Amino acid sequence: ALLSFERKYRVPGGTLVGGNLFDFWVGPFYVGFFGVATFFFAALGIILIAWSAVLQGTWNPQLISVYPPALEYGLGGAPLAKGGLWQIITICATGAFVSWALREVEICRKLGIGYHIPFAFAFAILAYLTLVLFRPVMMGAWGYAFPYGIWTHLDWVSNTGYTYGNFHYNPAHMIAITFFFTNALALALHGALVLSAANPEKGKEMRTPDHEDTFFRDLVGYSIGTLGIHRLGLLLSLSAVFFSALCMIITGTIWFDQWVDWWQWWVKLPWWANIPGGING
Amino acid sequence: FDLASLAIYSFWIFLAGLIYYLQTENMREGYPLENEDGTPAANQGPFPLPKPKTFILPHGRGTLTVPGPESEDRPIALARTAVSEGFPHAPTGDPMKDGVGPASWVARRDLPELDGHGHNKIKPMKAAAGFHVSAGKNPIGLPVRGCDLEIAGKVVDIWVDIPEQMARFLEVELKDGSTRLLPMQMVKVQSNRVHVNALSSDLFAGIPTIKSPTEVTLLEEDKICGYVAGGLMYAAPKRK
Amino acid sequence: EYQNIFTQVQVRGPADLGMTEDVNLANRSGVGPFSTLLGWFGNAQLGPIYLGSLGVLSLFSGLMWFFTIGIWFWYQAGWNPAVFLRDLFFFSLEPPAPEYGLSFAAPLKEGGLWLIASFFMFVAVWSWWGRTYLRAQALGMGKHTAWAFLSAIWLWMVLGFIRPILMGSWSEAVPYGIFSHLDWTNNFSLVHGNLHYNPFHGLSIAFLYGSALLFAMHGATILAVSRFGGERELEQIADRGTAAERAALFWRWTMGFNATMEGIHRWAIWMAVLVTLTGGIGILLSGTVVDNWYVWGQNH
Ligand code: BCL
Ligand code: BCL
Ligand code: BCL
Ligand SMILES: CC[C@H]1c2cc3[nH]c4c(c3C)C(=O)[C@H](C(=O)OC)c4c3nc(cc4[nH]c(cc(n2)[C@@H]1C)c(C(C)=O)c4C)[C@@H](C)[C@@H]3CCC(=O)OC/C=C(\C)CCC[C@H](C)CCC[C@H](C)CCCC(C)C
Ligand SMILES: COC1=C(OC)C(=O)C(C/C=C(\C)CC/C=C(\C)CC/C=C(\C)CC/C=C(\C)CC/C=C(\C)CC/C=C(\C)CCC=C(C)C)=C(C)C1=O
Ligand SMILES: COC(C)(C)C(=O)C/C=C(\C)CC/C=C(\C)CC/C=C(\C)CCCC/C(C)=C/CC[C@H](C)CC/C=C(\C)CCC=C(C)C
Ligand SMILES: CCCCCCCC/C=C\CCCCCCCC(=O)OC[C@H](O)CO
Ligand SMILES: CCCCCCCCCCCC[N+](C)(C)[O-]
Ligand SMILES: CCCCCCCCCCCC[N+](C)(C)[O-]
Ligand SMILES: CCCCCCCCCCCC[N+](C)(C)[O-]
Ligand SMILES: CCCCCCCCCCCC[N+](C)(C)[O-]
Ligand SMILES: CCCCCCCCCCCC[N+](C)(C)[O-]
Ligand SMILES: CCCCCCCCCCCC[N+](C)(C)[O-]
Ligand SMILES: CCCCCCCCCCCC[N+](C)(C)[O-]
Ligand SMILES: CCCCCCCCCCCC[N+](C)(C)[O-]
Ligand SMILES: [Cl-]
Ligand SMILES: [Fe+3]
Numbered sequence: 001a002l003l004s005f006e007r008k009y010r011v012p013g014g015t016l017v018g019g020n021l022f023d024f025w026v027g028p029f030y031v032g033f034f035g036v037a038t039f040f041f042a043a044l045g046i047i048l049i050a051w052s053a054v055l056q057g058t059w060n061p062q063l064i065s066v067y068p069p070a071l072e073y074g075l076g077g078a079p080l081a082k083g084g085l086w087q088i089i090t091i092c093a094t095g096a097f098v099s100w101a102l103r104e105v106e107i108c109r110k111l112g113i114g115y116h117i118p119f120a121f122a123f124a125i126l127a128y129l130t131l132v133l134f135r136p137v138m139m140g141a142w143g144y145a146f147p148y149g150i151w152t153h154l155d156w157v158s159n160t161g162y163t164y165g166n167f168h169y170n171p172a173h174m175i176a177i178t179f180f181f182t183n184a185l186a187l188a189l190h191g192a193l194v195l196s197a198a199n200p201e202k203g204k205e206m207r208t209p210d211h212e213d214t215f216f217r218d219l220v221g222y223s224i225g226t227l228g229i230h231r232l233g234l235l236l237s238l239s240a241v242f243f244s245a246l247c248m249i250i251t252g253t254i255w256f257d258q259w260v261d262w263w264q265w266w267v268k269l270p271w272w273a274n275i276p277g278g279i280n281g
Numbered sequence: 282f283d284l285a286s287l288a289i290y291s292f293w294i295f296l297a298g299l300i301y302y303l304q305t306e307n308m309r310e311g312y313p314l315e316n317e318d319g320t321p322a323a324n325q326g327p328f329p330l331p332k333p334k335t336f337i338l339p340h341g342r343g344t345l346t347v348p349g350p351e352s353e354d355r356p357i358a359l360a361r362t363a364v365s366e367g368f369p370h371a372p373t374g375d376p377m378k379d380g381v382g383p384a385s386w387v388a389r390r391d392l393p394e395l396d397g398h399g400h401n402k403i404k405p406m407k408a409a410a411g412f413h414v415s416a417g418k419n420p421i422g423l424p425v426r427g428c429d430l431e432i433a434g435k436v437v438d439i440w441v442d443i444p445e446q447m448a449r450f451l452e453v454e455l456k457d458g459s460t461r462l463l464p465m466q467m468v469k470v471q472s473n474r475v476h477v478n479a480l481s482s483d484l485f486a487g488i489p490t491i492k493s494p495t496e497v498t499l500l501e502e503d504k505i506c507g508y509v510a511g512g513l514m515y516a517a518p519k520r521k
Numbered sequence: 522e523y524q525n526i527f528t529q530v531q532v533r534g535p536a537d538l539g540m541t542e543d544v545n546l547a548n549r550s551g552v553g554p555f556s557t558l559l560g561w562f563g564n565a566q567l568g569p570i571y572l573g574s575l576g577v578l579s580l581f582s583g584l585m586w587f588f589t590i591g592i593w594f595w596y597q598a599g600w601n602p603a604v605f606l607r608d609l610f611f612f613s614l615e616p617p618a619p620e621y622g623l624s625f626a627a628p629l630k631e632g633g634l635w636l637i638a639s640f641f642m643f644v645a646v647w648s649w650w651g652r653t654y655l656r657a658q659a660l661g662m663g664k665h666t667a668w669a670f671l672s673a674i675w676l677w678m679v680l681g682f683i684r685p686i687l688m689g690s691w692s693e694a695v696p697y698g699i700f701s702h703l704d705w706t707n708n709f710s711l712v713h714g715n716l717h718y719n720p721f722h723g724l725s726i727a728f729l730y731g732s733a734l735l736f737a738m739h740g741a742t743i744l745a746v747s748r749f750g751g752e753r754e755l756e757q758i759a760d761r762g763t764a765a766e767r768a769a770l771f772w773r774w775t776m777g778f779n780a781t782m783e784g785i786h787r788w789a790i791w792m793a794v795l796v797t798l799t800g801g802i803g804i805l806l807s808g809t810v811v812d813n814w815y816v817w818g819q820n821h
Contacts, residue, residue: 001322003311003773004351005766008359011382012369013514025367030774107774111767112383112510114524114745120737154717168703184732184793188672191790192665196657198336198758198783204661205339209755210397210444211660213564214539218549218656221570225445226752227743228563231526234740237733263610272607277599279611284810286821288802289720299791307784310761311769338759345759387763394756397540406532415533415565416557441532446564448532449750466748469522470529478522499756503763506749 001027014110016102032106037099045092049148052085065149068142075140089148090132097125120234123241130245138253164251165258172247173259179240186236190229305331309347317366340399342392354388357381377487377508377515384511389499396444401496403449406439408495412446414439418470425453425463425475428512428520431482434461436475440497450497450505451475453485461488462497467509479512481519525747531560538569544659548573575652583645589638590614590697613698614638616691623689638697639681650674665790672794676801687809714813721803722814728795735792739785742768757782 002010012023017033024031052066053059069076069083078084104118136144146156161167168174193215197207209226216223224232255262267273267280275281305328312330314322336345358379359370377384394402406412414421420436427433433453437460440450450462453475469476480488489504491497497505523529536552553567594612598605617624617632627633654667685693695705710716717723743751751757751764761782769779780788811817 001314001324002317003766003769003779004313004315005311005353005387005761006770006773007315007317007370008353008357008381008385009767009770010370011359011376012362012371013382020369023369025774027367028773028777104771104775107771108745109514110383111771112507112513113767113771114522114748116524116741116745117738117771120741123737124734151718158715158717166703166707168707169700180729180733183736184729184796185673187732187736187789188669188793189666190736191786191788191793192669194754194783194786195790196663196665197755199663199665201658201661201663205337206755206759207660207662208339208395208397208540209753210537211540211542211662212755213444213537214397214544215656215660215662215666217539217569218544218571218659219653221550221553221568222564223566224559224563225447226754227445227447227525227747230740230743230747230752231562232740233736234744237737237740240733267607269607272603275601275603275607277601278597278604278608280608281604283817285806285817288806292721292724292799292802303784303787303791304778306787307778307780309784310765310781311779336759342759385763385766387761387766389760389762394753409534412532412534414530415555416531416560417529420530439530439532441534443534444537446532446534446537446566447528448530464748465529466523466525499760499762502750507763510748 009111011110015106016109030103030107030110032103034099034103034106038096038103041092041095041099045089045096048085048089048092051080052089055081055085062150065147065152067147067152068136068145071141071143073142075137075142078142083142086145086148087142090145094125094129094133097128101125116234120238123238127241127245130249135249135251135253138249144252160251164255165260167259169259169263170247170251171259171262172243172250176240176243176247179236179243183233183236183240186229186233190233301328304328309334311351312348317361317370340395342390355380377484377511380504380507380511382511383514384507386500386503386507389503391498391500393496393498400443402444403440403442403497405452405495406441409441409443412441412443418472420451420468420470420475423470423473423475425451425468425477425485427480427482427485428478428516429481429483430521433477433480433482433485455486457486459486459490460494461485462491462505463488464506464509467506477509478520479509479516481512481516484512484516525744527561531557531565533560533565536566540660542660544571545573548576571656573652573655575648575655579645579648579652582641582648586638586641586645589634589641593634610699611701613696613701615696615701616685616694619690619692621691623686623691627691632691635694635697636691639694643682646674646677669790669794672797672801676797676804679801679805684805684807684809687805693808709807713807713811714815714817716803716807716814718814718818719803719807719811720818721799721806725796725800725803728792728799732789732793732796735789738772739789742771745771754782754786 012020015023015032022031022033022036049066053064056064058064066086066089067083068086069078073083078087101118101121104121105115108115108118132145136142146153193212197212200207213223308328309331313325316322330348333346333348338345358373359381360373362368362371372379372381376382380386396402421438422435424432424435434455435453436451437454438452439448440452440462441447442449448465450465451468452460453463454460463477467477467479488508489501491501533555548571550569550572552569555565556567557565559565593614595605597612598608614635615632616635617627621627621632625636627636650667650670653670654664657664657666681694685691695702746764746768749762749764749767751768757765765782773779
């Protein structure tokens with residue numbers, strides 16, 4: 001079925017591969033070549049997940065956990081039950097994530113719109129590969145990657161973090177957090193501002209974008225604009241993820257001690273390093 | 282059975298209702314779903330259509346009630362390519378001229394968008410007292426080059442979003458003396474020229490024209506922007 | 522092609538003094554300078570700003586809070602400017618010890634000052650909330666901003682006021698310090714048996730991640746249809762254009778459903794406010810009802 005306004009947009013063309021072989025829809029979903037690829041990768045990764053659950057001995061989704069190979073395996077292949085499945089599932093996940101992005105690109109072309117959405121999605125993929133590929137490789141073992149389990153992969157975060165004391169002190173970790181908080185702050189303000197203008201007080205006409213500007217100038221003396229806030233929201237969310245991949249690719253690769261020790265270059269500058277008093281004196 | 286268990290259970294119930302509510306709110310446009318022949322589709326999903334809400338538009342422009350009887354209010358020059366559903370509908374003539382596909386436009390009101398005071402939101406800079414180029418390259422006077430590396434005209438003015446102090450269109454003078462509007466987001470201002478990758482030089486004349494030299498309506502904006510974006514797909518044969 | 526991340530050509534005109542409606546124009550400042558810098562990314566105009574009694578009370582009360590923490594840091598630094606800059610992030614204004622309970626009778630150097638600063642912060646935040654309400658009211662707008670702000674205030678009220686009271690000790694509040702308040706966060710989790718296994722904490726994370734997800738989707742979507750004037754979202758609500766249609770159809774073809782130009786902003790506001798809404802609940806239940814979340818988690 002279609003939206004009342006959808007038909008005039010369902011024209012042929014825009015594909016990158018296969019011409020018109022896969023240029024069709026299944027219900028609302030556009031297929032395309034990479035839609036078929038996505039389905040094939042996804043269907044495989046899911047089967048291997050079910051196969052790992054059989055080897056594990058449980059069909060409870062809260063207990064299923066596919067672990068990577070043991071550190072002793074280095075960066076080599078492992079048997080299916082001893083990390084191999086994690087390795088193949090990681091390949092399928094990557095295939096599905098990348099196929100998903102290229103499918104979005106085919107949809108951008110058929111609709112004559114920009115490629116911002118798949119470009120932003122690639123940052124999320126970058127973060128995933130930072131944890132399962134880039135960092136493990138640089139450290140020299142797949143085992144450093146995280147396990148595919150609902151709760152076991154929270155344990156990995158905890159174990160990895162506390163290996164370096166309090167991960168809070170990772171300076172790149174602070175920056176990424178600041179963007180995450182600021183992003184949610186900006187998202188709440190933006191959604192609230194549009195709704196407040198489209199849904200004003202009772203007995204009032206719809207407000208205008210000028211009211212939005214005026215509200216924020218009255219509140220904090222500056223309005224970024226209707227275009228600027230969407231540029232900002234895109235930037236805040238991508239930077240957050242960017243510094244997240246950054247704060248991990250340096251952990252265990254170029255930094256090995258507790259992150260609180262990184263802040264001593266400031267404390268122990270030879271001039272004020274000895275002045276008695278204070279916290280460090 | 283402790284207070285924590287009841288809190289997390291109560292929340293999941295609250296969240297289910299919230300999602301239900303959010304989905305129906307996002308069904309005020311484009312529903313009910315239609316078959317590819319325009320008739321109502323049998324399966325409309327589990328979520329019902331929301332109850333109408335009314336916006337009172339400012340400046341006496343009436344009221345909008347959504348959801349309401351939908352209408353394209355324009356001909357669609359497409360045709361089925363398959364008995365079964367889910368296949369492309371092919372243009373029957375010139376898609377850029379017929380405004381289909383990436384060249385589509387919507388039948389918005391043939392009126393200009395207004396600012397908070399009731400004045401035209403967008404205006405040519407020659408009619409905007411006090412506005413000027415404050416940073417970057419001033420495109421006025423520069424030649425406009427199409428994807429065929431030929432010159433279609435020269436920039437003669439900039440249409441400015443006054444409340445937001447933003448350039449939205451370039452007014453380009455064609456070889457024949459007339460002008461067209463080019464979306465600011467589809468041009469590249471360079472040192473010596475303005476490059477438009479979306480259109481070839483001989484497709485600028487095909488851009489829809491406006492009725493008034495000092496205002497542009499919402500309908501004309503959709504027609505102009507649709508045409509230019511449609512060039513990416515339909516002007517590609519002569520893109521060097 | 523052109524991506525519309527930074528403005529290509531800035532234009533500037535007579536400053537916008539804004540809508541009047543029922544705003545008391547006596548309390549609006551003059552217009553500030555234009556910033557060509559900010560113009561590359563958004564609007565270049567600075568000001569005017571509204572300065573009423575609440576704003577003055579908030580700004581003043583907020584500067585007292587800032588100055589109170591300040592003089593304490595200078596006192597910990599022994600009044601030495603060098604030691605001040607060296608240990609700036611290590612200084613901390615701690616709440617009263619557990620022995621004082623909920624008494625305001627703690628001497629200044631043992632949590633009395635933390636209570637004074639907390640009073641100023643309390644006045645500054647709540648007077649600023651009233652500010653966000655009246656500014657919307659003066660313009661005839663909805664109060665979505667004030668209600669969304671309440672969600673953040675809720676977590677802030679739980680951390681430093683509501684929960685300490687239910688626990689019966691100001692010592693359960695957070696300290697004022699850059700590093701010290703990070704350490705408080707770390708200990709809070711260890712003491713309560715790992716917050717990873719607090720379901721409201723996991724929910725809070727889902728909405729924090731989901732807010733970065735949703736804003737990257739929405740921001741990328743509006744820029745991708747800005748070639749059709751998609752950022753002018755209010756008029757797209759009153760009069761759907763091809764921008765709103767292409768935006769919806771991209772996502773419908775991608776994942777099977779879509780939003781409207783208005784509906785996407787209800788997704789956005791709820792995604793964000795649920796972060797601090799669920800979080801304030803998780804923190805409130807920690808130590809009051811549940812002592813160990815990992816253990817609690819294994820029984821359910
Ligand atoms: C005890 C634990 C440690 C700690 C240790 C770590 C470690 C270790 C790491 C982090 C990381 C992060 N931490 Mg920390 N951290 C702690 C305390 C905090 C606090 C806090 C208030 O205390 C905060 C706010 C944060 C914040 C954060 C973020 C900056 C970051 C996670 C986001 C991210 O990168 O996403 C990135 C996004 C993704 C990976 C998503 C990718 C999605 C892919 C592309 C698509 C999936 C599709 C899906 C399967 C399909 C399903 C389809 C169905 C239809 C549904 N940490 C404490 C001190 N933290 C992580 C990080 O930076 O990672 C790079 C990380 O590894
Ligand atoms: C980002 C840094 C850390 C990390 C740290 C944390 C922490 C800390 C927490 C989570 C939480 C979650 N994480 Mg994790 N997580 C990481 C990597 C991942 C990846 C991945 C492919 O890289 C995925 C798919 C997940 C998935 C999930 C969900 C089970 C859950 C809620 C996320 C959410 O709503 O996000 C925002 C996204 C949306 C709102 C959109 C919808 C996404 C849905 C929910 C995805 C479901 C995926 C499904 C369960 C798994 C695949 C199914 C396949 C069919 C096999 N994590 C890395 C290693 N994650 C929380 C939780 O409750 O865990 C139990 C939690 O507390
Ligand atoms: C060792 C650390 C612990 C842990 C301990 C905690 C604790 C403790 C808390 C969190 C909380 C949070 N944690 Mg945790 N957290 C851990 C691991 C993680 C991981 C991870 C990858 O492992 C992630 C992604 C997170 C993520 C998060 C967020 C979902 C959540 C914060 C919500 C928020 O926006 O607060 C930021 C927003 C606020 C603090 C609101 C403040 C609003 C006030 C009104 C602002 C006033 C500012 C002032 C007046 C003005 C300043 C000057 C200005 C310029 C004007 N945590 C581990 C397990 N986490 C919080 C929560 O809710 O938990 C349920 C919390 O309290
Ligand atoms: C980059 C900024 C943020 C962001 C942005 C973002 N995400 C995006 C996009 C964008 C712009 C899309 O366009 C795209 C989309 O279509 O969203 C609806 C997407 C997307 N982001 C998603 C999820 C997601 N994003 C996240 C984060 C973020 N996304 C960032 C914070 C997170 C988390 C945890 O924070 C998650 C879980 C999806 C909903 C969607 C992409 C879906 C996709 O690629 O589908 C094809 C794949 C399948 C259908 C199935 C693949 C399954 C595998 C083969 C097997 C499973 C293996 C897996 C590793 C198991 C691990 C599970 C455990 C860890 C629990
Ligand atoms: C301004 O304009 C905007 C809109 O319109 C006007 C919007 O509509 C949206 C979209 C946003 C929403 C609808 C809000 C809700 C989304 C959320 C909470 C994100 C989280 C989303 C989800 C959890 C859903 C995830 C679902 C999927 C990934 C789909 C599952 C995948 C399947 C079934 C497979 C895909 C199909 C194929 C590969 C093709 C089939 C293959 C064959 C071989 C047959 C945005 C951003 C916007 O700015
Ligand atoms: C030259 O330098 C001078 C001295 C001038 C300075 O100004 C330097 C000053 C600074 C650099 C200040 C730096 C500031 C900080 C380090 C502050 C850091 C703050 C945080 C990390 C966040 C902590 C906030 C969390 C808490 C603990 C909030 C408590 C709020 C409560 C809800 C208030 C509760 C109220 C109470 C108990 C009583 C008051 C009255 C009531 C009616 C309740
Ligand atoms: C130069 C003066 C700077 C003073 C700044 C005070 C503190 C603000 C800080 C962070 C919040 C982020 C603000 C962005 C929120 C904008 C919400 C929104 O939707 O704005 C769009 C537009 O303004 C409607 O027309
Ligand atoms: C589809 C191309 C994506 C390639 C990246 C996938 C990363 C998988 C890492 C595991 C490699 C396992 N192997 C082959 C060494 O046995
Ligand atoms: C580091 C992540 C690598 C995966 C990227 C592949 C998916 C396609 C994303 C890019 C498409 C967008 N763009 C602008 C390049 O056309
Ligand atoms: C025993 C009940 C425990 C509380 C359950 C919490 C679920 C309801 C609260 C959701 C938030 C509601 N509100 C008013 C903020 O929109
Ligand atoms: C299936 C039970 C549903 C009841 C739980 C709460 C659902 C209502 C969701 C909030 C409504 C949003 N609103 C109207 C306040 O903006
Ligand atoms: C992260 C939670 C997201 C919940 C999404 C559930 C709502 C999808 C509704 C699909 C129905 C739309 N349809 C096909 C009838 O047009
Ligand atoms: C604490 C969570 C608050 C809910 C956030 C969403 C606000 C919806 C309520 C709209 C307000 C209506 N009104 C008439 C006051 O403008
Ligand atoms: C408004 C959007 C709704 C998004 C809902 C996302 C649900 C994520 C589930 C996280 C799992 C939480 N829990 C309780 C198992 O810890
Ligand atoms: C985690 C909740 C489930 C995520 C997927 C929800 C969206 C499913 C696809 C949209 C509905 C498709 N259909 C065929 C009913 O139109
Ligand atoms: Cl005020
Ligand atoms: Fe928006």
